[PDB]
Design an enzyme around this catalytic site. Structure first.
Site, PDB file in Angstrom:
ATOM      1  N   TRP A   1      45.952  32.959  50.290  1.00  0.00           N
ATOM      2  CA  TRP A   1      47.009  33.058  49.560  1.00  0.00           C
ATOM      3  C   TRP A   1      46.378  32.956  48.084  1.00  0.00           C
ATOM      4  O   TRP A   1      45.983  31.874  47.945  1.00  0.00           O
ATOM      5  CB  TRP A   1      48.004  31.766  49.923  1.00  0.00           C
ATOM      6  CG  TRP A   1      49.135  31.692  49.106  1.00  0.00           C
ATOM      7  CD1 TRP A   1      49.806  32.757  48.252  1.00  0.00           C
ATOM      8  CD2 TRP A   1      49.784  30.587  48.499  1.00  0.00           C
ATOM      9  NE1 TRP A   1      50.675  32.169  47.464  1.00  0.00           N
ATOM     10  CE2 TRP A   1      50.762  30.638  47.589  1.00  0.00           C
ATOM     11  CE3 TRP A   1      49.575  28.849  48.990  1.00  0.00           C
ATOM     12  CZ2 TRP A   1      51.396  29.697  46.843  1.00  0.00           C
ATOM     13  CZ3 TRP A   1      50.269  27.960  48.249  1.00  0.00           C
ATOM     14  CH2 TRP A   1      51.534  28.646  47.458  1.00  0.00           C
TER      15      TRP A   1
ATOM     16  N   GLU B   1      37.701  34.072  36.229  1.00  0.00           N
ATOM     17  CA  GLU B   1      37.134  35.020  37.520  1.00  0.00           C
ATOM     18  C   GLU B   1      37.863  35.771  37.807  1.00  0.00           C
ATOM     19  O   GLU B   1      37.831  36.520  38.943  1.00  0.00           O
ATOM     20  CB  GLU B   1      36.751  34.043  38.441  1.00  0.00           C
ATOM     21  CG  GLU B   1      35.432  32.885  37.893  1.00  0.00           C
ATOM     22  CD  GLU B   1      34.466  32.527  38.950  1.00  0.00           C
ATOM     23  OE1 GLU B   1      34.227  32.913  39.916  1.00  0.00           O
ATOM     24  OE2 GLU B   1      33.679  31.555  38.378  1.00  0.00           O
TER      25      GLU B   1
ATOM     26  N   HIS C   1      32.605  35.042  40.840  1.00  0.00           N
ATOM     27  CA  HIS C   1      32.956  36.555  40.418  1.00  0.00           C
ATOM     28  C   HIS C   1      32.650  37.043  39.296  1.00  0.00           C
ATOM     29  O   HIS C   1      32.738  36.192  38.394  1.00  0.00           O
ATOM     30  CB  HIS C   1      34.524  36.477  40.833  1.00  0.00           C
ATOM     31  CG  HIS C   1      34.916  36.108  41.989  1.00  0.00           C
ATOM     32  ND1 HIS C   1      35.211  34.761  41.938  1.00  0.00           N
ATOM     33  CD2 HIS C   1      35.346  36.540  43.222  1.00  0.00           C
ATOM     34  CE1 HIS C   1      35.683  34.399  43.212  1.00  0.00           C
ATOM     35  NE2 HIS C   1      35.665  35.454  43.849  1.00  0.00           N
TER      36      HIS C   1
ATOM     37  N   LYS D   1      30.261  32.829  48.688  1.00  0.00           N
ATOM     38  CA  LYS D   1      30.834  34.153  48.262  1.00  0.00           C
ATOM     39  C   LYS D   1      30.923  34.540  47.069  1.00  0.00           C
ATOM     40  O   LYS D   1      30.744  33.761  46.335  1.00  0.00           O
ATOM     41  CB  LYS D   1      32.544  33.950  48.558  1.00  0.00           C
ATOM     42  CG  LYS D   1      33.081  35.334  48.376  1.00  0.00           C
ATOM     43  CD  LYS D   1      34.655  35.016  47.690  1.00  0.00           C
ATOM     44  CE  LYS D   1      35.331  36.525  47.223  1.00  0.00           C
ATOM     45  NZ  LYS D   1      36.406  35.928  46.371  1.00  0.00           N
TER      46      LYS D   1
END
Lengths: 252, 252
Positions: B47, B86, B143, B170
């Site tokens: 979400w 990010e 990121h 990640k």
């Protein structure tokens, strides 16, 4: 970057072209396979002449080539005798190999011929010149069924093929690790970006190298190989599955 | 290599898991999206809380989380506030960000939370510990929407996440060339082979990085992101297309 146009196919532009290989021990099995294959969608038909049993007779080989051509008149046809040293099925002398490629060239039945780079530079250049004089393209190849050479070695081999006049240089190597797969992709990209002035076919074999067969549009391989229906062994991809992955990557 | 089991999904084994992101500015749009998304096949629902307009109210955020959970009771749900630094949509203070993740953790409505590594080591470790005490997994992320760091830099960042307790590290980076895509795959494989003791998610963005979203089973990325139906911009892949490519690669 000079593309290669054969029949109405442009190699080196758009999505990677799909090659399928036909394998029959005699005229009747070649005919049965050609009729089965014309009900599959692919771009280039490769005939694996080393699986044919009567290779000692040039006339037998040309009769089989005609069977294929009559079953599929508009398909680009690649004539390939794969030597046993490069994973082929039979060993023949250098003279007989060159005779067969010349007979194929002269017949006007095939559009391209596969020439192994390690046949020897003088003989390779002579055959390339003979092919070109008869409007036949040359896929110059090299296969390492055991391991993956370094990226530098692969780029220099591909550059050597371009120097000998290959229309389309091709290299196929066996990965010993996942790292070897990255090496093949790296060498493909180096060729693409700095040294190729023509289409290049590259591939990493077996199950671990399958990604090399799907990502040619990204790193620079102009064609890939797939299986007609029923993929049997690990690492083969059926042509419809291969086509769906190439379109997905192309339209992303 | 410790896998991560959430609901009946095992992350880090088998084919890469598909994450889809839900984005709604208010309770009614979140509900309309949740009802649309339950008619799609995917493995993890993320979400994107930074698209929600009433983030100042913890109760508003939790009401929306409940809307999603009632529409899809058995799906693993990842709560992600992506900061503007990010690529997120809104800037909020570090305190508010940590408050929102804690409220989410406490609600018992989400299964995982996304924590940005650059939030700060003390705060990251504290939140990871709070999550773990409440049986919530942590996707620790980073990121770079502008460029691709070197492979060494990416591996050390991923290792730092593992050191801070991330369940699943990640990293998502932007390629400036095709070479940058190879760098991301290389760093993925290095992590896989020598330093990961848990699942790692890696991805190269945009059109040029699409292959990174399809080859995770090969180089080591445990999840990938796809779009629910209609892929809009270059580089997005619809979940059904993504699923077909992952099954083809898995069964090759």
């Amino acid at each position: 970057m000079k593309t290669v146009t054969v029949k109405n196919l442009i190699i080196g532009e758009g999505m990677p072209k799909i090659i399928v290989s036909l394998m029959g021990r005699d005229i009747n099995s070649v005919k049965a396979e050609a009729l089965a294959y014309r009900e599959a969608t692919f771009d280039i038909l490769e005939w694996r002449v080393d699986h044919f049993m009567d290779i000692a007779s040039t006339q037998s080989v040309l009769t089989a080539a005609r069977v294929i051509r009559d079953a599929m008149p508009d398909i680009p046809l690649l004539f390939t005798f794969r030597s046993a040293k490069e994973g082929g099925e039979q060993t023949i002398t250098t003279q007989h190999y060159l005779t067969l490629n010349r007979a194929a060239i002269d017949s006007g039945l095939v559009d391209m011929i596969d020439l192994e780079l390690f046949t020897g530079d003088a003989d390779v250049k002579a055959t390339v010149d003979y092919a070109h004089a008869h409007n036949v393209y040359v896929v110059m190849s090299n296969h390492d069924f055991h391991q993956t050479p370094s990226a530098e070695e692969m780029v220099s081999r591909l550059r050597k093929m371009q120097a000998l006049g290959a229309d389309i240089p091709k290299i196929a190597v066996m990965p010993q690790s996942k790292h070897d797969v990255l090496t093949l992709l790296t060498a493909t990209l180096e060729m693409q970006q700095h040294y190729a002035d023509r289409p290049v076919i590259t591939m990493s074999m077996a199950k671990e190298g399958v990604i090399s067969r799907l990502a040619g549009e990204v790193f620079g391989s102009a064609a890939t190989f797939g299986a007609v229906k029923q993929a049997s062994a690990p690492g083969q991809i059926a042509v419809n599955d291969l086509r769906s992955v190439l379109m997905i990557l192309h339209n992303a």
